Motif scaffolding. Structure first.
Motif, PDB file in Angstrom:
ATOM      1  N   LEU A  47       0.812  -1.211   0.000  1.00 11.10           N
ATOM      2  CA  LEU A  47       0.000   0.000   0.000  1.00 11.10           C
ATOM      3  C   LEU A  47       0.849   1.267   0.000  1.00 11.10           C
ATOM      4  O   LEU A  47       0.785   2.056  -0.947  1.00 11.10           O
ATOM      5  N   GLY A  48       1.649   1.479   1.045  1.00 12.47           N
ATOM      6  CA  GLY A  48       2.427   2.700   1.118  1.00 12.47           C
ATOM      7  C   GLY A  48       2.151   3.581   2.322  1.00 12.47           C
ATOM      8  O   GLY A  48       2.431   4.782   2.279  1.00 12.47           O
ATOM      9  N   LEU A  49       1.607   3.013   3.398  1.00 17.41           N
ATOM     10  CA  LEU A  49       1.345   3.757   4.626  1.00 17.41           C
ATOM     11  C   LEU A  49       1.985   3.090   5.834  1.00 17.41           C
ATOM     12  O   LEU A  49       1.866   1.874   6.012  1.00 17.41           O
ATOM     13  N   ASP A  50       2.678   3.889   6.648  1.00 19.30           N
ATOM     14  CA  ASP A  50       3.175   3.417   7.933  1.00 19.30           C
ATOM     15  C   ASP A  50       2.007   2.901   8.765  1.00 19.30           C
ATOM     16  O   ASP A  50       0.885   3.406   8.679  1.00 19.30           O
ATOM     17  N   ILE A  51       2.276   1.879   9.584  1.00 23.20           N
ATOM     18  CA  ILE A  51       1.241   1.310  10.446  1.00 23.20           C
ATOM     19  C   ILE A  51       1.073   2.010  11.789  1.00 23.20           C
ATOM     20  O   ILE A  51       0.077   1.752  12.481  1.00 23.20           O
ATOM     21  N   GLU A  52       1.971   2.924  12.165  1.00 23.95           N
ATOM     22  CA  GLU A  52       1.760   3.639  13.423  1.00 23.95           C
ATOM     23  C   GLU A  52       0.787   4.803  13.279  1.00 23.95           C
ATOM     24  O   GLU A  52      -0.078   4.995  14.143  1.00 23.95           O
ATOM     25  N   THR A  53       0.920   5.607  12.223  1.00 24.29           N
ATOM     26  CA  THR A  53      -0.121   6.586  11.932  1.00 24.29           C
ATOM     27  C   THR A  53      -1.470   5.908  11.726  1.00 24.29           C
ATOM     28  O   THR A  53      -2.510   6.441  12.136  1.00 24.29           O
ATOM     29  N   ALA A  54      -1.465   4.708  11.139  1.00 26.95           N
ATOM     30  CA  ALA A  54      -2.700   3.947  10.985  1.00 26.95           C
ATOM     31  C   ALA A  54      -3.240   3.477  12.330  1.00 26.95           C
ATOM     32  O   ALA A  54      -4.456   3.473  12.542  1.00 26.95           O
ATOM     33  N   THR A  55      -2.359   3.117  13.263  1.00 24.97           N
ATOM     34  CA  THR A  55      -2.825   2.743  14.594  1.00 24.97           C
ATOM     35  C   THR A  55      -3.430   3.940  15.316  1.00 24.97           C
ATOM     36  O   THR A  55      -4.464   3.816  15.981  1.00 24.97           O
ATOM     37  N   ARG A  56      -2.794   5.104  15.197  1.00 26.39           N
ATOM     38  CA  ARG A  56      -3.340   6.323  15.788  1.00 26.39           C
ATOM     39  C   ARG A  56      -4.719   6.643  15.215  1.00 26.39           C
ATOM     40  O   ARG A  56      -5.659   6.966  15.955  1.00 26.39           O
ATOM     41  N   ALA A  57      -4.864   6.551  13.894  1.00 29.58           N
ATOM     42  CA  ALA A  57      -6.149   6.877  13.282  1.00 29.58           C
ATOM     43  C   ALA A  57      -7.211   5.828  13.606  1.00 29.58           C
ATOM     44  O   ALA A  57      -8.397   6.159  13.729  1.00 29.58           O
ATOM     45  N   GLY A  58      -6.814   4.565  13.772  1.00 32.80           N
ATOM     46  CA  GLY A  58      -7.751   3.568  14.257  1.00 32.80           C
ATOM     47  C   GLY A  58      -8.150   3.795  15.697  1.00 32.80           C
ATOM     48  O   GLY A  58      -9.278   3.482  16.088  1.00 32.80           O
ATOM     49  N   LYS A  59      -7.240   4.336  16.508  1.00 30.76           N
ATOM     50  CA  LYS A  59      -7.625   4.792  17.838  1.00 30.76           C
ATOM     51  C   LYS A  59      -8.658   5.908  17.731  1.00 30.76           C
ATOM     52  O   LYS A  59      -9.598   5.981  18.528  1.00 30.76           O
TER      53      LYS A  59
END
Lengths: 195, 195
Positions: A47-59
């Motif tokens: 995809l092309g996205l870091d998983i930590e910013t994704a974890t924050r946004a899922g929070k």
């Protein structure tokens, strides 16, 4: 779009990981944990996205679903589940020799016109609240000889039915059965909650 | 001796004759009426006693049985009959793969040690009085899958059993079943009258 559901995935993974940290998780549970750290890594890469910013946004999205739970998770009363019938009784096949079917306010009423001069008892499995019948799982008419001959069932494709609807359906079923000289009797768990 | 029972016969014949005089009697009823005026005439003849003195003395013996009814026919309360089970359910054959039987105060308790990890419900047909369980016709344990696995039955050759006896038998049955990790549930008509 997809990124938002993937933030949901990454956060929910971190959640069940924090679970697993107590090491109470099952072997397949942790298998899925590995399988999913794998799948999520593969998706974050192709995809092309870091998983930590994704974890924050899922929070953030669990904060929105938590605002949904904060709109008032839980109602204000409690329910009780009452059972006259074993699952067998609820799911046992039957037939009527001369059907009588009818629809009445999200309730299907079936009976057999061919039943005469029997003693019939009515059993139902349902749900109460405030000592009143909340919702009907199912009702069935049995002969002392053991035969199903009538059925009051909830119609799924409609927006709910009421306790008065059920007392009416019961009264109508009992009337139809009694027309042919059948003595109809109600299980105590219906007397006590639906008359 | 025999003369006294024959006074009973002659009087009871005169009674059902007075019934028949309203002409509501059945054809076989009146057939028996004829058959019995015949038999009673034949007996009074090959015996040697007039049937009117015998009718008077049978009136005297119904006055004695009426003094028996005058000792207090009817008790002082009323009973109610509660049914969880169709006759079929009460009389359906079953078996246990590894029986456990026990006698406890005029009650037979049966169960199957081989039942594990099932949901069992207990149905009973019995009699109440003063909103308390008077006497137990029968109780049976069914699995949601539909199988009988335990039974609490009244012992006929004993002088009655009590409501506490039944609550004890129920508790013991539930304990034995729950030992093998079976979740046991009670039909509402037992909660409401026998706990």
């Amino acid at each position: 779009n997809t990124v938002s559901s993937f933030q949901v995935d990454c956060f929910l993974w971190h959640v069940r990981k924090r679970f697993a940290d107590q090491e109470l998780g099952d072997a397949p549970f942790l298998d899925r944990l590995r399988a999913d750290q794998a799948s999520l890594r593969g998706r974050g890469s192709t995809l092309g996205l870091d998983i930590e910013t994704a974890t924050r946004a899922g929070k953030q999205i669990v904060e929105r679903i938590l605002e949904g739970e904060s709109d008032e998770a839980l109602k204000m009363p409690a329910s009780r589940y009452l059972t006259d019938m074993t699952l067998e009784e609820m799911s046992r096949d039957w037939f009527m020799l001369m059907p009588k079917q009818k629809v009445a306010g999200s309730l299907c009423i079936r009976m057999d016109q061919a039943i005469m001069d029997k003693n019939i008892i009515l059993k139902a499995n349902f749900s109460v609240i405030f000592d009143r019948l909340e919702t009907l799982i199912l009702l069935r008419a049995f002969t002392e000889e053991g035969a199903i001959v009538g059925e009051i069932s909830p119609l799924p494709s409609l927006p709910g039915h009421t306790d008065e609807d059920v007392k009416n359906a019961i009264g109508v079923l009992i009337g139809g059965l009694e027309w042919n000289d059948n003595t109809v009797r109600v299980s105590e768990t219906l007397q006590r909650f639906a008359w």
